[PDB]
């Protein structure tokens, strides 16, 4: 996905 500054899955 979209990274947020942060974000994960899969």
Not at 1 to 10: A, W
């Amino acid at each position: 996905q979209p990274d947020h500054e942060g974000t994960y899955d899969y």
